[PDB]
Amino acid sequence: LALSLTADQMVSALLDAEPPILYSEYDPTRPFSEASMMGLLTNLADRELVHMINWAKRVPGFVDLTRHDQVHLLECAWLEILMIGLVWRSMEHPGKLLFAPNLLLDRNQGKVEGMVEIFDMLLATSSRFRMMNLQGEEFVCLKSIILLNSGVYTFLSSTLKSLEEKDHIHRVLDKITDTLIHLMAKAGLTLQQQHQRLAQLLLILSHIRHMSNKGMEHLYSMKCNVVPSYDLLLEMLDA
Amino acid sequence: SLALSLTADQMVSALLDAEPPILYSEYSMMGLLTNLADRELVHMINWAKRVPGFVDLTRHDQVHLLECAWLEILMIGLVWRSMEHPGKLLFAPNLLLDRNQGEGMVEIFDMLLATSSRFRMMNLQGEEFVCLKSIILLNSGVYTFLSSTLKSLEEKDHIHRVLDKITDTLIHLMAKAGLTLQQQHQRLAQLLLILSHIRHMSNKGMEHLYSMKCKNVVPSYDLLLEMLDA
Ligand SMILES: CC(C)=CCn1nc(-c2ccc(O)cc2O)c2cccc(C(F)(F)F)c21
Ligand SMILES: CC(C)=CCn1nc(-c2ccc(O)cc2O)c2cccc(C(F)(F)F)c21
């Protein structure tokens, strides 16, 4: 089971679980309009969705959850997860968001003003990871943490099983924390640097939550989808 | 620079000394929060000026931090107040609400409750608490300064440096309470992850103000700037 993994076995499992990078619908009309871009982002996200489920089911400890909790965690975290993907992808492309390898946009290219604030936010984050020289093995830990953390406070409670599930999530989070710290020691950071890096990394998740909330906000503000329903996800979950 | 030299114990002591008082609700739900919020904000600005590192920022930077953190700061105070009242939110000593007295915003109410209860199972400590509060003041708005000029870059480093001193401070508090090296970093992580949840609740909150046509209760950049300058 998942709580038994060493830190080395946790990084390995997480690396192996990695989803693939997808391409954007090939050769769209350029220049873009506001909706054409959104049609492209939306299409891409939907296609990534399928793969994130495959990825989520291989996150040590995810499967031990009832289906209901697996869905609720994904519901809450999916955009955050895409967004950290993006920001990772974009690190060595100052000024640009690499949504797909055939879809690399600067702040002017794509066609709203609330959108450009998010874009700006994604760019900032990406620089920050670049500044911190974020490592791949750290990124997979962070992405996993996002998955297990984002929706855990809103399980709601009561029943003993509801408490068990929350307690299990929290224990997996702890091993991921042990894993991050292990990577940091391994790399030769002092304890003090280790603690500090861990904090700096985790604080960034709060910004990623914020951006997701902003993004979700916008998504709900179109008369179109375009946001995976509970049943959609449940289904996608049964093997 | 001052702030960067503090010890873990001096940092905590500065932070406890700076705590706002707990105010009473003076005397519709939106009515009561607005009355309370408005009075609390005055105190929050004076608390903020006392957070080590914070006055070393430019006034425009102080304002942006506050503008970004204000609801999360209210909210976290609320969760800490309610910690010892499971099932209830202690808005004020004379305004302690249960889930059922909770029109819209029962979602936010529930989340608030869940956070409080998370606090309670964690045995969250007053000293840890004040450290998290400060972390939020300095973290929530730092990624959106605007870099550009040399100053804005110097301001960002300085914030990150203070944040690191709050990190050392939390760890010190845990090492001193007896936690093992392992338990220290797991607890530091559990603490900070909760902050994502607070951000989340704050955003839902704002969302809810705008759909209540209550956009007005928000402190504006200029409102904030005038209060700081006093
Ligand atoms: C241009 C802006 C402000 C984007 C925010 N955003 N980002 C992605 C996304 C899709 C795939 C991916 O891998 C990573 C992503 O971040 C995305 C997908 C749908 C809607 C939005 C939104 F929120 F803008 F409406 C999205
Ligand atoms: C100005 C307004 C109404 C903000 C909205 N607000 N304010 C507080 C809050 C206020 C003061 C305080 O001491 C503690 C609090 O938690 C609060 C708590 C729960 C939900 C909301 C909601 F949904 F309106 F955003 C809240």
CSV table of N, CA and C in Angstrom, one decimal, chain A residues 4-65:
chain,number,residue,atom,x,y,z
A,4,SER,N,3.6,2.8,2.7
A,4,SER,CA,4.8,2.0,2.9
A,4,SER,C,6.0,2.4,2.0
A,5,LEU,N,5.7,3.1,1.0
A,5,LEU,CA,6.7,3.5,0.0
A,5,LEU,C,7.8,4.3,0.7
A,6,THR,N,9.0,4.1,0.3
A,6,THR,CA,10.1,5.0,0.7
A,6,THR,C,10.0,6.3,0.0
A,7,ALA,N,10.8,7.3,0.2
A,7,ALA,CA,10.8,8.5,-0.6
A,7,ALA,C,11.3,8.2,-2.0
A,8,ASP,N,12.3,7.3,-2.2
A,8,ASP,CA,12.8,7.0,-3.5
A,8,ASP,C,11.7,6.3,-4.3
A,9,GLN,N,10.9,5.5,-3.6
A,9,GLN,CA,9.9,4.7,-4.3
A,9,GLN,C,8.7,5.6,-4.6
A,10,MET,N,8.6,6.7,-3.9
A,10,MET,CA,7.5,7.6,-4.1
A,10,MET,C,7.8,8.5,-5.4
A,11,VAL,N,9.0,9.0,-5.5
A,11,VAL,CA,9.4,9.8,-6.6
A,11,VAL,C,9.3,9.0,-7.9
A,12,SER,N,9.8,7.8,-7.9
A,12,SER,CA,9.7,6.8,-9.0
A,12,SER,C,8.3,6.6,-9.5
A,13,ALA,N,7.4,6.3,-8.5
A,13,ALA,CA,6.1,6.1,-8.9
A,13,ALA,C,5.5,7.3,-9.5
A,14,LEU,N,5.8,8.5,-9.0
A,14,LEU,CA,5.3,9.7,-9.5
A,14,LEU,C,5.8,10.1,-10.9
A,15,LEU,N,7.1,9.9,-11.1
A,15,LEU,CA,7.6,10.1,-12.4
A,15,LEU,C,7.0,9.1,-13.5
A,16,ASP,N,7.0,7.8,-13.2
A,16,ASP,CA,6.3,6.9,-14.0
A,16,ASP,C,4.8,7.3,-14.3
A,17,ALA,N,4.1,7.9,-13.4
A,17,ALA,CA,2.7,8.2,-13.6
A,17,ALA,C,2.5,9.4,-14.6
A,18,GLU,N,3.5,10.2,-14.7
A,18,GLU,CA,3.4,11.4,-15.6
A,18,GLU,C,2.5,11.3,-16.8
A,19,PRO,N,1.6,12.2,-17.1
A,19,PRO,CA,0.8,12.2,-18.3
A,19,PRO,C,1.6,12.7,-19.5
A,20,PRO,N,1.1,12.4,-20.7
A,20,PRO,CA,1.8,12.9,-21.9
A,20,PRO,C,1.5,14.4,-22.1
A,21,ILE,N,2.4,15.1,-22.9
A,21,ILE,CA,2.1,16.4,-23.4
A,21,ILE,C,1.3,16.3,-24.7
A,22,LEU,N,0.2,17.0,-24.7
A,22,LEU,CA,-0.7,16.9,-25.9
A,22,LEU,C,-0.5,18.2,-26.8
A,23,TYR,N,-0.9,18.0,-28.1
A,23,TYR,CA,-0.9,19.1,-29.0
A,23,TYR,C,-2.2,19.7,-29.1
A,24,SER,N,-2.2,21.0,-29.4
A,24,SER,CA,-3.4,21.8,-29.6
A,24,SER,C,-4.0,21.4,-30.9
A,25,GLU,N,-5.3,21.6,-31.1
A,25,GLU,CA,-5.9,21.3,-32.4
A,25,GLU,C,-5.0,21.9,-33.5
A,26,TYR,N,-4.6,21.1,-34.4
A,26,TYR,CA,-3.6,21.6,-35.3
A,26,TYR,C,-4.0,22.7,-36.3
A,27,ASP,N,-3.2,23.7,-36.5
A,27,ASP,CA,-3.4,24.7,-37.5
A,27,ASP,C,-4.8,25.4,-37.4
A,28,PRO,N,-5.0,26.1,-36.3
A,28,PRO,CA,-6.3,26.8,-36.2
A,28,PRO,C,-6.2,28.1,-37.0
A,29,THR,N,-7.3,28.7,-37.3
A,29,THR,CA,-7.3,30.0,-37.9
A,29,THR,C,-6.4,30.9,-37.0
A,30,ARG,N,-5.4,31.6,-37.6
A,30,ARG,CA,-4.7,32.7,-36.9
A,30,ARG,C,-4.9,33.9,-37.8
A,31,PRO,N,-5.1,35.1,-37.3
A,31,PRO,CA,-5.1,35.4,-35.8
A,31,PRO,C,-6.2,34.8,-35.1
A,32,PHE,N,-6.2,34.8,-33.8
A,32,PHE,CA,-7.3,34.2,-33.0
A,32,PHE,C,-8.3,35.3,-32.7
A,33,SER,N,-9.6,34.8,-32.5
A,33,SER,CA,-10.6,35.6,-31.8
A,33,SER,C,-10.7,35.1,-30.4
A,34,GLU,N,-11.6,35.8,-29.6
A,34,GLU,CA,-11.6,35.5,-28.2
A,34,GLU,C,-12.1,34.1,-27.9
A,35,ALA,N,-13.2,33.8,-28.7
A,35,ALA,CA,-13.8,32.4,-28.6
A,35,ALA,C,-12.9,31.4,-29.3
A,36,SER,N,-12.2,31.7,-30.3
A,36,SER,CA,-11.4,30.7,-31.0
A,36,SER,C,-10.3,30.2,-30.1
A,37,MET,N,-9.7,31.2,-29.5
A,37,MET,CA,-8.7,30.7,-28.5
A,37,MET,C,-9.4,29.8,-27.5
A,38,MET,N,-10.5,30.3,-26.9
A,38,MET,CA,-11.2,29.5,-25.8
A,38,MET,C,-11.6,28.1,-26.4
A,39,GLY,N,-11.9,28.0,-27.6
A,39,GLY,CA,-12.3,26.8,-28.2
A,39,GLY,C,-11.1,25.8,-28.2
A,40,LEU,N,-9.9,26.4,-28.4
A,40,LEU,CA,-8.7,25.7,-28.4
A,40,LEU,C,-8.2,25.2,-27.0
A,41,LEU,N,-8.4,26.1,-26.1
A,41,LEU,CA,-7.9,25.8,-24.7
A,41,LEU,C,-8.8,24.7,-24.2
A,42,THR,N,-10.1,24.9,-24.4
A,42,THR,CA,-11.1,24.0,-23.9
A,42,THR,C,-11.0,22.7,-24.5
A,43,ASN,N,-10.8,22.6,-25.8
A,43,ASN,CA,-10.6,21.3,-26.5
A,43,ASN,C,-9.4,20.6,-25.9
A,44,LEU,N,-8.3,21.4,-25.8
A,44,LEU,CA,-7.1,20.8,-25.2
A,44,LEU,C,-7.3,20.3,-23.8
A,45,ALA,N,-8.0,21.1,-22.9
A,45,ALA,CA,-8.1,20.7,-21.5
A,45,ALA,C,-8.9,19.4,-21.5
A,46,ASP,N,-10.0,19.3,-22.2
A,46,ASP,CA,-10.9,18.1,-22.3
A,46,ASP,C,-10.1,16.9,-22.6
A,47,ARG,N,-9.1,17.0,-23.5
A,47,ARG,CA,-8.3,15.9,-24.0
A,47,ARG,C,-7.3,15.5,-22.9
A,48,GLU,N,-6.8,16.6,-22.2
A,48,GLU,CA,-5.9,16.3,-21.1
A,48,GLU,C,-6.7,15.6,-19.9
A,49,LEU,N,-7.9,16.0,-19.8
A,49,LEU,CA,-8.7,15.4,-18.7
A,49,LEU,C,-8.6,13.9,-18.6
A,50,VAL,N,-8.8,13.2,-19.7
A,50,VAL,CA,-8.7,11.8,-19.8
A,50,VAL,C,-7.4,11.3,-19.2
A,51,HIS,N,-6.3,11.9,-19.6
A,51,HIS,CA,-5.0,11.5,-19.1
A,51,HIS,C,-4.7,11.8,-17.7
A,52,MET,N,-5.4,12.8,-17.1
A,52,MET,CA,-5.1,13.2,-15.7
A,52,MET,C,-5.7,12.2,-14.8
A,53,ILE,N,-6.8,11.6,-15.3
A,53,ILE,CA,-7.5,10.5,-14.5
A,53,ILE,C,-6.5,9.3,-14.5
A,54,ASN,N,-5.9,8.9,-15.6
A,54,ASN,CA,-5.0,7.8,-15.7
A,54,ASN,C,-3.8,8.2,-14.7
A,55,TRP,N,-3.4,9.4,-14.7
A,55,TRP,CA,-2.4,9.9,-13.8
A,55,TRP,C,-2.8,9.8,-12.4
A,56,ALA,N,-4.0,10.3,-12.1
A,56,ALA,CA,-4.5,10.4,-10.7
A,56,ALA,C,-4.5,9.0,-10.1
A,57,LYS,N,-5.1,8.0,-10.8
A,57,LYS,CA,-5.2,6.7,-10.3
A,57,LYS,C,-3.8,6.0,-10.0
A,58,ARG,N,-2.7,6.6,-10.5
A,58,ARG,CA,-1.4,6.1,-10.2
A,58,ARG,C,-0.7,6.9,-9.1
A,59,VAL,N,-1.4,7.9,-8.6
A,59,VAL,CA,-0.8,8.6,-7.5
A,59,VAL,C,-0.9,7.8,-6.2
A,60,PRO,N,0.2,7.4,-5.6
A,60,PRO,CA,0.1,6.5,-4.5
A,60,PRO,C,-0.9,7.0,-3.5
A,61,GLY,N,-1.9,6.1,-3.2
A,61,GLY,CA,-2.9,6.4,-2.2
A,61,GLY,C,-4.2,6.9,-2.8
A,62,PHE,N,-4.2,7.5,-4.1
A,62,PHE,CA,-5.4,7.9,-4.7
A,62,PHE,C,-6.5,6.8,-4.7
A,63,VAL,N,-6.1,5.6,-5.2
A,63,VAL,CA,-7.0,4.5,-5.4
A,63,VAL,C,-7.7,4.0,-4.1
A,64,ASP,N,-7.0,4.2,-3.0
A,64,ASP,CA,-7.5,3.7,-1.7
A,64,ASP,C,-8.8,4.5,-1.3
A,65,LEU,N,-9.1,5.5,-2.0
A,65,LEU,CA,-10.2,6.4,-1.7
A,65,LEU,C,-11.5,5.8,-2.3
